[PDB]
């Protein structure tokens, strides 16, 4: 192949070529929401993952494509796509293959099951079957019937389940992955994949991130799973079904919730408002959400509230005025948002409001009280703030103009 595939790999620092090798757990021409890769990298590499993603980009080992404002600085990565050339990805798959001639000793194990034909190692007689892998990915197709084998996976820190089925039962050997830090489940099928056996996750003492894509789940039932060490929950393009026993100290570590493109979500489950430890709540592109329960005011430690590109969200809960720790309010994309909360000015820690297309939003009198405030918006939306400014202490109006490209077409 190219003189800068082999060579830019052979020069790579340790961490970067390990990341490159992680890329082999994704499918051919997968459209990866960067959030996925950041979550995966989080356990091993902490906060340096976007740095690593950009590093791999700049040496042409992967491609990055923004599909929105992409203010990655805030910690949001739902607005960046990652693509990798299938030649680089096949190279990586074979590097993972050549790291160990024994599939049981391999660090990265990429398992593939078509027409329910399990590979021979999965059917081996001398149980127990124990794998050594740290990164474990499993790709199943749309005829897959979820008739799993039994094995132990003591070392797995990251699990990528690539699923194409209408129905999918998580395998019970997940419950052996005591070291698991990240679980990524993406459905490539036409129909939302209805997951079952999510309880295999219930007792994983190190499980810090979960991300579901284009699956069907009971958002309401998520706290019944315990998930006592979970720090982030992400749901993308997922169908929600309404609805087992409540549990004591549910989601006591939960710190960030991201919900995107959940097209039949019509009300926030009440339990989200009751997660006292929650720092960040992002709901975007949920086009049937008309209202947000006022119980969200109960979220004391909230610092970021993102209710964004929700086509149907006409007003905000007034009780946002109790979010004493709120730094950042993002309602950009609210073409129909009509008013900000009446007492928004009560908040003494609010540093930034983003409202880039809320050109029908009226501004409450209380905003004058807010000081040292940055407002990110468009020029039209900027009009009312330009009038308020002289009355206000150190208001900064940052006018954002849109960058037009065809990148969202990748998600077609």
């Amino acid at each position: 192949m190219n003189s800068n595939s082999i060579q830019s790999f052979d020069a790579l620092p340790h961490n970067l070529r390990e990341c490159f090798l992680d890329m082999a757990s994704f499918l051919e021409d997968q459209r990866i929401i960067a959030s996925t890769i950041i979550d995966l990298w989080s356990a091993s590499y902490g906060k340096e993952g976007m740095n690593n993603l950009q590093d791999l980009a700049s040496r042409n080992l992967l491609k990055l494509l923004p599909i929105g404002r992409n203010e990655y600085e805030d910690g949001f990565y739902n607005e960046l796509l990652v693509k990798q050339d299938n030649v680089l990805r096949e190279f990586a798959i074979n590097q993972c293959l050549k790291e160990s001639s024994s599939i049981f000793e391999r660090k990265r194990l990429n398992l593939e099951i078509q027409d329910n034909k399990f590979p021979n190692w999965c059917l081996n007689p001398k149980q127990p079957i124990v794998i050594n892998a740290s990164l474990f990915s499993i790709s199943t197709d749309d005829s897959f019937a979820s008739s799993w084998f039994e094995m132990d996976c003591p070392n797995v820190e990251a699990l990528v389940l690539n699923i194409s089925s209408s129905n999918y039962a998580l395998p019970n050997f997940i419950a052996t992955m005591k070291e698991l830090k990240v679980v990524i489940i993406i459905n490539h099928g036409l129909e939302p994949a209805k997951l079952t056996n999510l309880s295999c996750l219930s007792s994983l003492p190190n499980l810090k991130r979960i991300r579901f894509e284009k699956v069907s789940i009971s958002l309401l039932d998520i706290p019944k799973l315990g998930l006592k060490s979970l720090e982030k929950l992400s749901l993308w393009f997922c169908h929600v079904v309404d609805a087992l026993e409540d549990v004591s100290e549910t989601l006591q570590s939960l710190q960030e919730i991201e919900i995107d493109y959940c097209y039949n979500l019509d009300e926030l489950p009440y339990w989200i408002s009751q997660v006292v430890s929650l720092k960040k709540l992002s709901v975007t592109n949920c086009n049937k959400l008309c209202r947000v329960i006022e119980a969200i005011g109960d979220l004391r430690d909230l610092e970021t509230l993102r209710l964004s590109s929700c086509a149907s969200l006409l007003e905000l809960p007034e009780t946002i005025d109790r979010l004493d720790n709120l730094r950042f309010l993002d309602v950009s994309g609210g073409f129909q948002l009509k008013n900000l909360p009446l007492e928004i000015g009560k908040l003494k820690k609010l540093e930034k409001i983003s409202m880039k297309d809320c050109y029908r939003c009226e501004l409450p009198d209380s905003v004058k009280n807010l000081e040292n405030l940055e407002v990110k918006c468009d020029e039209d939306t900027a009009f009312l703030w330009k009038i308020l400014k002289p009355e206000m202490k150190n208001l900064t109006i940052t006018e954002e103009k849109t960058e037009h490209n065809l990148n969202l077409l990748q998600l077609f």
């Binding site: 036409l190 284009k214 393009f237 493109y261 592109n285 073409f335 039209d380 969202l408 077409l409 077609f412």
Partner: protein
């Protein structure tokens, strides 16, 4: 110093130096103070009195009525668009299907519609001839004259001259619904209600419309803003006869004083005036964003052709079974924004045309026509997913209908040539209800196959609707008026054709030859 207060006093002066007030009022005086009288015993002898004055450079019409009951004559007649007693069906709207008129004035208009219907045609001709028409009346006479003017405002083209109705101490005429219909409307600009500053009107049900000349001893103010007129004239029914001869005299003096109008009121007019101006400007700049949204939709459509389903079907499919993010943005960002925008455009320009000569100017009319042909199919896809029926005759959003009517009217006057060998890949189907026809025929085919116990008579109607659709399809192909994209494998039209082939029979069908031989694969392509 407010541009509104300045404009109000300057406009009042303009009206006064007009001589329109002296003309109108002197004629009104003649009704009860006849200029020529004869004393022949022979020639001398409740209802409506009226007189036509066909002057040289205008035609003036005076209406007069018996003096009004004061303590409780509020009465209200309700007029619904589907009511046949309604003389003003054209006034009704989708947001305003009904309104109410003060009943004495209304009945006085109706009684006299006879013998004054004839008048209506002449006046319209007179206007058509570019000759002004004033219609005027004091008190309930003004109320009736206003109803008559409204009766003459059935058709409002920016190019037809319009009557002017001038009133003197009249009571109110319409309710809040009539007000909403008339606001900021060319019709609204046809009425000048001269009132005294000391006059008060009870306004709990009847509401002001049109422009008001509010007269003081120092001079008058022309007020167009109806909440200001409410502010200045609402009291508790404190009417007093005002000799308007005396008011006209004192206006004539003009030797006006400071503070005729309270500051807060002026401020309100100015505020609302400036919001309105900014809204107008915003519509103009936001058109550019809407064109950009159209450009995203162009790329959606090309991709949908490449994948061989077509945009309409992809939109329909993806709306029923969401699985990709781009489509959700197409629908909830761009199509949604486009719909709010163009609805608002139509609703505005049928109130206030955009130029002397046009309801919609070319940028709006032309890109509105493109928007119609491009995006009405998506609204049709939604409509049929919802299980609704008969989209053309029962389901079209009004704004699409107006954009079609207006573009057709102007198209009559446009020199154009369609080249018979142009590639039509990018043609926007002229009949933007075409997909509604496809979906209706699909429905009838299902009814034929799935309905048992169906009577013979119905089946024949169904079958001929079937052959009708076939003829419509063949004519639009013949006339090169459909996008070639209807022929994509996964489209609803090809579905229709597959189902229909099985049902249809034994007849000349240029369509079936065309399909069977695959010449549809060459439709719209050349060299």
């Amino acid at each position: 110093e407010s541009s509104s207060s300045l404009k109000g006093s300057a406009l009042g002066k303009l009206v006064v130096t007009s001589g329109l007030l002296h003309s109108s009022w002197s004629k009104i005086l003649e009704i009860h103070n006849p200029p020529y009288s004869n004393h022949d015993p022979g020639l001398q002898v409740s209802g409506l009195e009226f007189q036509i004055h066909r002057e040289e450079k205008f035609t003036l019409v005076v209406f007069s009525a018996p003096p009004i009951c004061r303590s409780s004559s509020s009465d209200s007649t309700l007029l619904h668009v589907k009511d046949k007693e309604n003389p003003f069906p054209f006034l009704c709207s989708e947001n305003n299907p009904s309104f109410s008129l003060h009943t004495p004035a209304f009945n006085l208009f109706t009684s006299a519609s006879t013998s004054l219907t004839y008048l209506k045609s002449e006046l319209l001709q007179t206007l058509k001839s570019e000759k002004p028409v004033i219609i005027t009346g004091a008190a309930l006479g003004g109320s009736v004259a206003s109803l008559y003017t409204l009766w003459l405002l059935e058709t409002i083209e920016p190019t037809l001259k319009r009557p002017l109705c001038i009133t003197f101490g009249s009571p109110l005429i319409g309710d809040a619904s009539l007000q909403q219909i008339l606001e900021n409307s060319v019709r609204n600009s046809c009425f000048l209600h001269v009132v005294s500053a000391q006059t008060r009107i009870k306004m709990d049900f009847f509401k002001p419309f049109g422009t008001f000349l509010i007269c003081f001893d120092s001079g008058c103010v022309c007020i167009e803003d109806h909440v200001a007129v409410t502010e200045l004239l609402n009291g508790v029914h404190d009417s007093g006869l005002v000799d308007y001869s005396q008011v006209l005299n004192r206006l004539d003096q003009s030797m006006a004083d400071s503070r005729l109008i309270p500051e807060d009121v002026i401020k309100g007019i100015e505020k609302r005036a400036e919001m309105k101006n900014l809204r107008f400007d915003m519509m103009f700049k936001k058109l550019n964003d809407m064109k950009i949204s159209m450009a995203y939709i162009e790329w959606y459509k090309k991709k949908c052709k490449e994948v061989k389903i077509g945009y309409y079907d992809r939109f329909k499919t993806q709306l029923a079974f969401p699985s990709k993010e781009f489509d959700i943005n197409i629908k909830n960002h761009h199509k949604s924004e486009l719909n709010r925008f163009w609805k608002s455009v139509v609703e505005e320009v049928e109130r206030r045309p955009q130029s002397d000569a046009s309801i919609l100017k070319r940028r709006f009319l032309f890109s509105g026509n493109n928007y119609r042909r491009m995006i009405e199919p998506l609204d049709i896809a939604e409509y049929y997913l919802e299980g609704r029926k008969e989209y053309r005759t029962t389901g079209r959003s009004h704004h699409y209908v107006m954009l079609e009517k207006w573009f057709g009217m102007e198209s009559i006057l446009i020199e154009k040539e369609r080249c018979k060998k142009r590639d039509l890949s990018d043609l926007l189907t002229f009949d933007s209800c075409f997909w509604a026809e496809v979906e209706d025929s699909l429905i009838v085919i299902n009814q034929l196959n799935t309905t048992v116990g169906m009577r013979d008579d119905v089946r024949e109607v169904l079958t001929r609707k079937l052959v009708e659709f076939e003829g419509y399809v063949w004519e639009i192909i013949t006339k090169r008026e459909v996008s070639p994209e209807i022929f994509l494998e996964e489209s609803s039209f090809m579905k229709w054709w597959k189902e229909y082939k099985k049902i249809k029979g034994f007849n000349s069908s240029y369509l079936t030859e065309f399909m069977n031989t695959r010449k549809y694969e060459s439709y719209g392509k050349s060299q």
